């Protein structure tokens, strides 16, 4: 089912030490598989990509998760070191980038802030309200708080961009995020390059029957900024990328904490070049390109990477950069929102990309790209025939992609239906809606899509994925469904996390005395003791 074209690069999946210098390449040969997989006969507005790596089509009539109070996009759950997703004292809690609803959706980026939502834990998606039943908790940070780390306080804009959030047994949250300062003249041009930093702020859940309040988030710690040897700086490129921290423990390195994030390869913009390994052709392939032709094409302006860092202390307040784990030199500008997902002894690196960010001569859908190997640093194999595509928006590659604010006349109306996807336990994938519709009849989202299900490692082949069209309604699950598979129960320094099954059992056994404990009511020493004993057992 492939059109003729270059063969994909041979990747070994071999693991290296996290501290080693090996950087895997998503090569031009790999990326050209995306065109081979496309159906050249697909007519106007129909999907040309294979159904197994295409997201189910989102309906244009979607609910809004915030009742249109805010625009919502990149969202993340509360996680542990294994990326399990958490409720705290009976409440699922998510963090989202939000922007005031009065803004044009495309102006959201320079006015972005982190907000949070919550909803009752343990309700199946089909039994929740249509819009997911989330309550908007408001903004995480008081005005001015995130400005604290910037030496240069003359910024014109100051935003919070994407990250992740780690929960502790005491209900504490370590919020890893991208803290960004812009320095713009009134006409929108730069005084100097913007300043995105990877940052941490600690806070805490305060929950009762009425809902969730977040406390703390008073102090921001500056963790990392682009260095210029591994990750491109503003001096190297005014519009360099550096964002989106995701932390985790690697099963192969217990007791250590790592982070991945988006960067660019550390080359001066104007002198950046690609080499034979970036091109990745098998020697002799009649479809091979020359290094000189690619370097002359403009492709050298697309040099995205995925970075790795390691924590130097238990508090996760000090980090050291490690060499990049994946580069996309002359393939894409932007390997966004990287995460590492562990399954069957493999490291899966998932990232998100736009169609328009592909380099000259390359093309692919908006959506999820992924890579598998034997270690967090490995010679990663891009998924699905070496293409890298795991979950693309429906897309006709035979027609121009257009833009989310200006759809192309001949393009699939779901081309921009989903972005900033995030892969959850069991291969569930949550994403936000950007645009759905045709050139004369489209709408912007700014709310979450239905959660979908991607099966990872089909037919015993770890390099293959397939969309589960039996999930929900022809692949579409619950709107804004970000389910917790672990449940933290915590009060006054005591805390334990339990499974779905355990949580149900505990609630049945304790009945009403548990509800009072979780409402923060006074309980007798005897009741406190029996709750803590039952929790400790599970």
Tokens 């999907």: give the residue: 47
Look at residue 290 and give its three-state secondary structure: coil
Q: What Rg value do the Cα atoms of the chain yield, rounded?
A: 23
Find the catalytic residue in 250, 336, 434, 481: 336
CB-based contacts of 144: which residues, under 8 Å, 6+ apart?
A: none
SS3 for 78-109 is EECCCCCEEEECCEEEEEEEEEECCCCHHHCH
How far apart, in whole angstroms, are the C-alpha atoms of residue 177 and residue 53? Answer: 30
What string of H, E and C letters represents the secondary structure of 386-417?
HCCEEEECCCCCCCCCCECCECCCCCCCCCCC
Q: What is the four-CA torsion angle of 406, 409, 413, 415, rounded to 10 degrees?
A: -70
> Any known ligand binding at 334?
yes
Q: Is 335 helix (H, G, I), strand (E, B) or coil?
A: coil
Whether the Cβ atoms of residue 88 and residue 167 lie closer than 8 Å to each other: yes
Q: What angle do CA 430, 32, 48 make, to 5 degrees?
A: 60
- 516 labeled part of a ligand binding site: no
Tokens 């736009």, located at residue = 354
Residue 336 among the catalytic residues: yes
437 annotated as a binding-site residue: no
CA dist 148 and 344 (Å) reads 42
> Concatenated DSSP letters for 150-184?
-S----SEEEEEEEEEEE-TTSEEEEEEEEEEE-B
Question: How many C-beta neighbours within 10 Å does residue 187 have?
Answer: 5
- 10 Å CB burial of residue 496 (0-12, 13-18, 19+) is middle
60 annotated as ligand-binding = no
Separation in Å, CA 94 to CA 74, 121, 293, 471, 518 = 11, 12, 46, 23, 19
Resolution of the determined structure in angstroms stands at 1.6
Confirm or deny that 162 is annotated as ligand binding: yes
Is 357 annotated to bind a ligand? Reply is no
Distances (CA, A) of 443 to 6, 172, 323, 436, 495: 38, 38, 41, 6, 44
How many angstroms from the chain centroid is the CA of residue 448? 13
Closest by CA to 95, choosing from 209, 240, 217, 195, is: 217
* d(C-alpha 48, C-alpha 377), whole Å: 33
The reply to whether 276 sits in an annotated binding site is no
Distance CA 384, CA 364 (A): 13
128 is in an annotated binding site: no
Closest CA to 331 of 355, 353, 288, 362: 362
Check the annotation: does 268 bind a ligand.
Answer: yes
* Burial of residue 273, with CB atoms counted within 10 A of its CB: 0-12 exposed, 13-18 middle, 19 or more buried: middle
Selection from 120, 82, 115, 84 nearest residue 101 by Cα: 115
Do 471 and 455 form a contact (C-beta atoms < 8 A)? Answer: no
Tell me the technique behind this structure: X-ray
Going from the N-terminus, what domains does the chain have, and what CATH number goes with each? 1-485 (2.115.10.20), 486-538 (no CATH)
Contacts of 269 (CB under 8 A, 6+ apart): 236, 237, 238, 301
Task: Give the tokens for residue 84.
Answer: 């399990």
Helix (H) or strand (E) holding 317, with range, is none
**Do the Cβ atoms of 401 and 421 come closer than 8 Å?**
no
Contacts (Cβ under 8 Å, ≥6 apart) of 345: 374
Distance separating alpha carbons of residues 428 and 55, to the nearest angstrom: 12
Locate tokens 């899509």: which residue?
449
**Paired tokens of 122:** 């343990």
- How far is Cα 397 from Cα 366, in angstroms, rounded to an integer? 11
Question: Is there a binding annotation on residue 473?
Answer: yes
Query: DSSP of 418-473, one letter per residue?
Result: -EEEEEEGGGEEEEE--EEEETTEEEE--SB-B-EEEEESGGG-TT-EEE-TTSTB
Task: Give the orientation angle of helix 525-537 with respect to helix 500-510, to 10 degrees.
Answer: 150
12 is in an annotated binding site: no
Q: Where are the beta strands (DSSP E) in 314-409?
A: 319-329, 336-343, 346-353, 367-373, 381-382, 389-392
Give the residue from 31, 13, 15, 90 showing the smallest Cα distance to 377: 15
Q: Is 451 annotated as a binding residue?
A: no
Q: Is 19 annotated as a binding residue?
A: yes
**Is 61 annotated in the active site?**
no
- By DSSP bridging, strand 419-424 and strand 428-432 are antiparallel
Q: What's the token pair of residue 474?
A: 């022809």
Q: Quick one: tokens of 226?
A: 């682009």
C-alpha span between 510 and 529 (Å, rounded): 12
Residue 197 assigned as binding residue: no
**How many angstroms separate the first and last alpha carbons of the chain?**
50
- The Cα-based distances of 159 to 9, 45, 183, 384, 403 in angstroms read 39, 36, 12, 36, 24
Q: Please identify which of the residues 30, 74, 366, 379 carries the catalytic annotation.
A: 74
Report whether 245 contacts 262 (CB < 8 A).
no
Name the token pair of 198. 């990877």
- The helix/strand count (H/E) of the chain reads as 8, 27
Q: How far is CA 168 from CA 244, 447, 506, in A?
A: 21, 28, 21
Residues in the chain: 538
Neighbours of 509 (CB within 10 A): 12
Pairing state of beta strands 319-329 and 336-343?
unpaired
500 marked as binding residue: no
DSSP strand pairing (452-456 vs 24-25): unpaired
């Amino acid at each position: 089912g492939l059109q003729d074209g270059p063969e994909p690069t041979i990747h070994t999946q071999q693991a290296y030490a996290p501290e080693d210098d090996f950087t895997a390449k998503w090569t031009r040969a790999d990326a050209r598989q995306l065109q081979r997989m496309s159906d050249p006969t697909a007519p106007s507005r129909e999907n040309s990509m294979p159904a197994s790596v295409t997201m189910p089509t989102v309906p244009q009539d979607f609910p809004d998760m915030s009742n249109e109070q805010v625009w919502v996009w990149d969202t993340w759950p509360l996680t542990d070191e294994d990326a399990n997703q958490y409720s705290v004292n009976g409440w699922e809690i998510i963090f989202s980038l939000v922007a005031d609803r009065n803004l044009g959706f495309d102006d959201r980026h320079v006015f972005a802030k982190i907000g949070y939502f919550y909803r009752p834990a343990g309700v199946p998606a089909a039994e929740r309200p249509e819009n997911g039943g989330w309550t908007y908790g408001g903004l995480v940070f008081k005005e001015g708080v995130t400005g604290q780390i910037f030496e240069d306080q003359s910024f014109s804009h100051q935003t919070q961009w994407s990250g992740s959030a780690r929960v502790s047994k005491n209900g504490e949250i370590k919020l890893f995020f991208t803290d960004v300062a812009f320095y713009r003249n009134s006409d929108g041009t730069n005084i100097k390059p913007y300043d995105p930093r990877i940052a941490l702020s600690v806070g805490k859940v305060k929950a009762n029957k009425k809902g969730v309040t977040l406390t703390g988030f008073n102090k921001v710690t500056d963790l990392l900024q682009a260095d210029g040897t591994y990750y491109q700086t503003g001096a190297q490129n005014e519009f360099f990328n550096f964002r989106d921290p995701f932390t985790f423990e690697d099963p192969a390195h217990p007791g250590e904490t790592f982070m991945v994030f988006e960067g660019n390869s550390a080359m001066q913009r104007e002198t950046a070049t690609c080499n034979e390994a970036d091109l990745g052709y098998r020697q002799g392939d009649p479809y091979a390109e020359t290094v000189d032709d690619v370097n002359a094409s403009g492709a050298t302006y697309q040099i995205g990477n995925v970075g790795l860092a390691k924590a130097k202390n238990k508090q996760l307040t000090e980090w050291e950069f490690l060499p990049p784990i994946l580069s996309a030199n002359c393939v894409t500008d932007q390997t966004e929102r990287p995460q590492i997902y562990f399954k069957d002894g493999k490291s899966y690196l998932f990232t998100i990309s736009h169609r328009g960010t592909f380099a000259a001569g390359l093309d692919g859908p908006e959506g999820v790209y992924g890579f598998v190997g034997d270690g967090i640093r490995s010679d990663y194999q891009p998924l699905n025939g070496g293409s890298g595509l795991a979950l693309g928006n429906p897309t006709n590659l035979n027609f121009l992609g257009g833009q989310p604010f200006a759809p192309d006349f001949n393009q699939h109306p779901g081309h921009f239906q989903a972005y900033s996807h995030y892969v959850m336990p069991g291969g569930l994938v949550q994403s936000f809606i950007d645009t759905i519709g045709t050139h004369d009849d489209f709408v912007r989202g700014g709310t979450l899509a239905p959660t979908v299900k991607m099966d990872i490692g089909v037919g015993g082949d770890p390099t293959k994925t397939a969309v589960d069209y039996s999930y929900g309604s022809e692949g579409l699950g619950g709107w804004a469904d970000i389910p917790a598979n672990k449940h933290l129960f915590t009060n006054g320094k005591f805390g334990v996390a339990v499974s779905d099954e355990a949580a149900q059992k505990i609630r049945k056994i304790l009945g009403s005395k548990f509800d009072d404990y979780l409402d923060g009511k006074p309980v007798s020493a005897t009741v406190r003791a029996l709750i803590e004993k039952l929790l400790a057992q599970y």
